[PDB]
Amino acid sequence: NNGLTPQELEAYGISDVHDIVYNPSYDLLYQEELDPSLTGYERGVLTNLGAVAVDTGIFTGRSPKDKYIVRDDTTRDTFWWADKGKGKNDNKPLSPETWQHLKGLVTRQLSGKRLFVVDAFCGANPDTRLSVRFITEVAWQAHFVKNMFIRPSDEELAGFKPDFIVMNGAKCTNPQWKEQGLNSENFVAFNLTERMQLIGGTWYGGEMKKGMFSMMNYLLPLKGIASMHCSANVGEKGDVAVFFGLSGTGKTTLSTDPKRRLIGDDEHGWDDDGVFNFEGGCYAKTIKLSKEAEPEIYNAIRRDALLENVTVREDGTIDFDDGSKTENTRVSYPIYHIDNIVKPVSKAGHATKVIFLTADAFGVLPPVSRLTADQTQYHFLSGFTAKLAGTITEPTPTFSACFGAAFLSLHPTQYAEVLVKRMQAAGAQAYLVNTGWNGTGKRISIKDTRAIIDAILNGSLDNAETFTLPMFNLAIPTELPGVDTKILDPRNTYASPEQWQEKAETLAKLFIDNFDKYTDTPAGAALVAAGPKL
Ligand SMILES: Nc1ncnc2c1ncn2[C@@H]1O[C@H](COP(=O)(O)OP(=O)(O)OP(=O)(O)O)[C@@H](O)[C@H]1O
Ligand SMILES: [Mg+2]
Ligand SMILES: [Mn+2]
């Protein structure tokens, strides 16, 4: 029935829907979250910055072990399954039967309640975008999807017909999990035949964000459109730059550059016209957030922005440095909270600069180096980054294909293939930047990192004289405008170049061991030459 009547939700299996809050405004959401009635995790608090902060509960990040995709006649022969001959991933198969069981738990949990329904888009271009309908019973959750996805116009809602439905049943869990062979009572399931996503047990909003991203990572490459885990911005001359990288590497902090127009900060596609954003907002990290170091992001934290897991003092002030509940404190905000952005549609032309961000805890890789075409692919499939696990003692490596393995629905080489095709057609140049550590035991400052990005974007790096770094065979500059020459050669940051050597051999070996699983095909076996060598 036209409009968005309760009888329309009955088709989804939801019953006794009393009140339906359809596409709530930011003001409605504001009063909903501050309602003194609210108890538990539904309760939001007001901070001295005018933004409301919520607690996501026990889950303060994604839960890949609870992710499942229904294996049926639609997904069977196309999906990159975790139990298939292909690589290690989180795409665990699920039977249609267990799906229906999980669906029953969700629809029942959402029956006889006041439901928030947010209609939106995933993808800036109408020809490849997904019309998604989110259903929840928690206000701050509908707020999160309002911030993160593309907010439709009144005229667009008129002819709005969803392609995908996501039902968030955070308050319910699956008690029959042991009998079904699942990881736990919690669940994040997808069914491509019904085009739905179910969430149970976990309150974390990121599951809906990354969940839709995973779906885009499935549909687009099959159409020849690159789907990427990267930030992106444009210059006044129209030069587009994409920044790939794993979590915590700098895609958001570095693309948020006042001198350039922000396209997006995390999920983009690349078609015949160019690079386009999937989202309608940004999701910044807030631990130890410095207003001096990252002023644009700090000023975005105001009414309508949603703080997550941050610790708010009695006086309402936020302690950004406190990571007691989690180091993964975040804040989402609609994109317009950033001044210099592409308006009204988040898209631009083909990218000409392709930057790979990595936080090397081993202190081996150089701050910046220009990559050859074969090294571009080698490093893309490698997806290296290292944290520093050890209360930061003993660096621990992470190799995540395409810089976002956790969101891949297809085999990694399928993404590399479509990426290489787009880069070629545009004569794009690739670079590798170490936003991490060096022999000093301290992470490179944001100031130094921004200077390096400018040199890459302004061309002064392309004109610089370079020499080859041994083992990894990376072309590194002799000098660069704005940055200290001493840090350009990673070996200079150690007391003796012998220290670098030893650590470099360790890292090189890890890379070689990791890439070995790709050498099954001639193309990948050919790429081994583009990797490190002892
Ligand atoms: N030199 C540096 N370069 C970049 N970021 C730095 C640097 N030094 C410190 N940081 C901090 O590291 C983090 C980089 O975070 P960022 O939010 O950009 O990750 P991201 O790539 O967007 O990951 P995700 O996909 O999870 O959003 C921020 O907390 C930033 O303040
Ligand atoms: Mg980010
Ligand atoms: Mn991300």
Swiss-Prot record:
Write out the function statement from the record: Involved in the gluconeogenesis. Catalyzes the conversion of oxaloacetate (OAA) to phosphoenolpyruvate (PEP) through direct phosphoryl transfer between the nucleoside triphosphate and OAA.
The residues that hold substrate are R62, Y204, K210, R330
EC number, as in UniProt: 4.1.1.49
The positions annotated for binding ATP are 210, 229, 245-253, 294, 330, 443-444, 449
Name of the top EC class for this enzyme: lyase
Keyword list (alphabetical) reads:
Acetylation, Allosteric enzyme, ATP-binding, Calcium, Cytoplasm, Decarboxylase, Gluconeogenesis, Lyase, Magnesium, Manganese, Metal-binding, Nucleotide-binding
> Which pathway does the database say it acts in?
Carbohydrate biosynthesis; gluconeogenesis
What is the protein's given name? Phosphoenolpyruvate carboxykinase (ATP)
| Cofactor list | Mn(2+)
The subcellular localization recorded is: Cytoplasm
Which sequence ranges form a coiled-coil region, renumbered to this chain? none
> One Pfam family, short name please?
PEPCK_ATP
Q: Which cysteines are joined by disulfide bonds?
A: none
Q: How does it assemble?
A: Monomer.
GO CC term (a single one) = cytosol
Indicate the impact reported for G281S. Answer: In PCK53; shows reduced-activity
Give the family, as the similarity comment puts it: Belongs to the phosphoenolpyruvate carboxykinase (ATP) family.
